[PDB]
Amino acid sequence: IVEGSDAEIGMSPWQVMLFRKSPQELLCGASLISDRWVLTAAHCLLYPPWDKNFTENDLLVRIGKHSRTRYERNIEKISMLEKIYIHPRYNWRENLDRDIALMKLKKPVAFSDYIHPVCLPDRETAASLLQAGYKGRVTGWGNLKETGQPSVLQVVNLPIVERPVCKDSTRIRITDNMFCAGYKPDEGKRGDACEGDSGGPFVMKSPFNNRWYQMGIVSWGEGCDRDGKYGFYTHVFRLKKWIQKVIDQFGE
């Protein structure tokens, strides 16, 4: 996370680290949506251009973490993957459209003061909050600069940007399954997700019921925190139907 700050303890209890076993390393960010379901970006698992195509056994899910590199005894819980589900229409060929994936953990994780699920938005919640100017929150252990790594989970609040502005900031084709966030060159403030943050959550706290909802998944970006560029996010609600069906088809 570029230009963010250290997360408070227990500030993002749904934060999940997608960890590579061999070598042992941070692969991506992710989020806890129930005791057995972890949500992330499809690109974190399958992405041919970067020769990425992980299988369950290649991965480990680290939940309840704060420190980046340290094994947090008695706090974090490390789970194994039973199955990975990637959106059937995820398009890595043209533009990372429908960049979303679900991972079912082998056995339920126990909630604690550091482990707790985030809500998925309903139609009304999404309509009311997914508006230009409204701020969301992005967290992760990714790079602090485009070109180091944080010691602790970083957090940054960023404003949703008008779709026209998002489109005009890049030559890439934006789809309705994506949204962008971040400050404009003249807004003074800054911050953005970066390498190591993808797959992570973009959440918003509903002022109607005081609950945190995950509106986006760190998807793609050009550089990190570049003036005139914005971070793009998978529109979670737009793909909720897929989420619903997978969870009640193969889930618990």
Binding site: E8, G10, I33, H116, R137, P159, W212
Partner: peptide
Amino acid sequence: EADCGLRPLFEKKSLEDKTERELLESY
């Protein structure tokens, strides 16, 4: 989820984190 989005160390004990107000002020 029935208790989703309510954090044990914050919402659960009516404590607010250091920057959430920024979010709510933008709504």
